[PDB]
């Protein structure tokens, strides 16, 4: 993985030694080249994963997440350079350094072959994320949002660390390849019940599981755009990726330990979708939308079927690009009206016709219009969950109805109707803003032409 | 009450640069930053990256499996063997308990 780790670190000297006015040009140009080279990770085989060395490996589950992670860095620089335009030069470079360090930890997280290595890098993402939110957030509540994010994560991670070190003691290794051949069944006992909870509750918090989701709307409402893009697109996926890897060694106990968490996700997705219908804050609506979408991923991972893992893989990528796009779209409005209230600025299709096309495209992917990968992922989870129990089709079907209702309601509220009379500073969309949305939606739609590369290792 | 700068009035890039692309206040930097984004973002990653993905060699041996499956179906039907036999492993190599 050193062909990606070293170039990513080189983004730090490049940013720091760039001429004052060129920090955004240079970092964006070279972070796109790194994203270009990330396509070499797609040398995947039917049987064996791509195992580079004793430290790092790539398979069909980490490759799409790795390509998504490196694609996102150049997009966050475009989204960031406006509201930082008046920032002190050095503090601009530190902000960019935090994003670069986040990509560095993330690409190593997704490729670490050792679970304790995964944990350290998994837990290291907290530092840059916390700093971004609390330092470059714009409101008072960014400090509380930082603490909730910090202590929700550590509350689950510290039990996870104990469980992993216990597992290496009794199994001898935490290398993921080794654990595939040396895994032994987990038998019923109160001791193994708590080993199961420790191994999973750290990932459930990052998804987030309904019930443990209340840190997420806080963080989003207070984070800067770049913090919201990485948090929604990639950081939520750390939990899903961790659950797809750790469930290997939790069988067959996952058969009955999954039940409470499937109930929370099946019911939680209906309630979070319904909450989206009454949200008054635009960023908070998109945050509660992620909780609804990620509840499908939890259900899919927990029922453990070939179709459910393919569906969950597609959902994570598709939701990553869609949720990031929606946040950027709401930010473009916020940079104008300087408010997150959804009802404040209405009838924007009249004043910003092309930005209204981006809003339409983003909403359609959110409600999963065929054949988008948002639907493909969502459909595969529904097909497999129906086999798990036919009655779930009712909850799955209802969620699609509610998901359509609030996706188009957000489109209708802000883009249609009459424009707000007194808001007279809606300047035409900048080339920067239009390019930012096209870089979300075009790759998302292109993947429909070849979806196998986002269907994970069970394809 | 206490000494503090007032919040500066929000600024509009089009005011002093009607051709602004929104990247920078400097027109020369603004055009450059636009070109690196559009060139590398669209010309390189999306166009070449899509072409690269289109021509990936037998990603996860999906074509090989079909070719092999054809070879076995031809063989087993000519020699009268079952197309697919339920036992995945040869039962002579197994030793059941009790």
């Amino acid at each position: 993985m050193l062909k990606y780790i070293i170039p990513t670190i080189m983004l730090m000297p490049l940013t720091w030694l760039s001429k004052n006015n060129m920090i955004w040009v240079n970092s964006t140009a070279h972070s796109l080249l790194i994203s270009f080279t990330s396509l070499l990770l797609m040398n995947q085989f039917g049987d064996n994963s791509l195992n580079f060395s004793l430290l790092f490996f790539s398979d069909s589950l980490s490759t799409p997440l790795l390509i998504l992670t490196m694609w996102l860095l150049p997009l966050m620089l475009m989204a960031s350079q406006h509201h930082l335009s008046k920032e002190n030069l050095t503090r601009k470079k530190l902000f960019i350094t935090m994003l670069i360090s986040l990509q560095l930890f993330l690409i190593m997280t997704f490729t670490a072959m050792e679970l304790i290595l995964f944990y350290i890098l998994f837990e290291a993402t907290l530092v840059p994320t916390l700093i971004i939110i609390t330092r470059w957030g714009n409101q008072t509540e960014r400090l509380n949002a930082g603490l909730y994010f910090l202590f929700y994560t550590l509350a689950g991670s510290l039990p996870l660390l104990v469980a992993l070190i216990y597992i290496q003691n009794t199994v001898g290794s935490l290398n993921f390849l080794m654990l595939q051949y040396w895994v032994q069944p987990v038998h019923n006992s109160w001791s193994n019940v708590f080993m199961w909870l420790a191994c999973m509750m750290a990932f459930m918090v990052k998804m987030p599981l309904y019930g443990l989701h209340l840190w997420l709307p806080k963080a989003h409402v207070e984070a800067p755009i770049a913090g919201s893009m990485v948090l929604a697109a990639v950081l939520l996926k750390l939990g899903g990726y961790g659950m797809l890897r750790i469930t290997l060694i939790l069988n067959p106990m996952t058969d009955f330990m999954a039940y409470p968490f499937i109930m929370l996700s099946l019911w939680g997705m209906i309630m979070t979708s319904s909450i989206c219908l009454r949200q008054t804050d635009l960023k908070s609506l998109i945050a509660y939308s992620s909780v609804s979408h990620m509840a499908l991923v939890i259900v899919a991972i927990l029922i453990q079927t070939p179709w459910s893992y393919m569906g969950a893989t597609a959902l994570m990528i598709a939701h990553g690009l869609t949720s990031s796009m929606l946040f950027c779209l709401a930010n473009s409005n916020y940079e104008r009206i300087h408010s997150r209230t959804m009802i404040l600025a209405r009838g924007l299709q009249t004043l910003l016709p092309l930005m209204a096309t981006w809003w339409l495209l983003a909403s359609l992917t959110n409600l999963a219009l065929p054949p988008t990968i948002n639907l493909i992922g969502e459909l595969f989870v529904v097909m497999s969950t129906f086999s798990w129990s036919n009655i779930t089709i009712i909850l799955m079907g209802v969620n699609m109805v509610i998901t359509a209702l609030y996706s188009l309601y957000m489109l209708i509220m802000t883009q249609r109707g009459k424009y707000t009379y007194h808001i007279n500073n809606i300047s035409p969309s900048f080339t920067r803003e239009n390019a930012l949305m096209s870089l979300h939606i075009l790759p998302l739609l292109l993947l429909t032409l070849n979806p196998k590369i986002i269907l994970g290792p069970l394809y | 009450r206490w000494q503090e700068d007032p919040e500066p009035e929000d600024e509009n890039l089009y005011e002093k640069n009607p051709d602004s692309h929104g990247y920078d206040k400097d027109p020369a930097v603004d055009i450059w930053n636009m070109r690196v984004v559009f060139f590398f973002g669209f010309s390189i990653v999306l166009v070449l990256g899509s072409t690269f993905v289109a021509y990936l060699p037998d990603y996860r041996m999906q074509e090989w499996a079909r070719r092999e499956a054809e070879r076995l179906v031809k063989y087993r039907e000519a020699h009268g063997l079952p197309i697919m036999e339920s036992n995945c492993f040869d039962p002579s190599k197994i030793q059941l308990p009790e």
């Binding site: 470059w136 957030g137 714009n138 409101q139 008072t140 960014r142 300087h338 | 206490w2 919040e7 500066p8």
Partner: peptide, 19 residues
């Protein structure tokens, strides 16, 4: 709206003998 930063009322939360 420019970034919020602590004012006097906020700072005095930390100037007492105890929190």
């Amino acid at each position: 709206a420019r970034q919020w930063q602590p004012d006097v009322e906020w700072a005095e939360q930390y100037g007492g003998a105890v929190m």
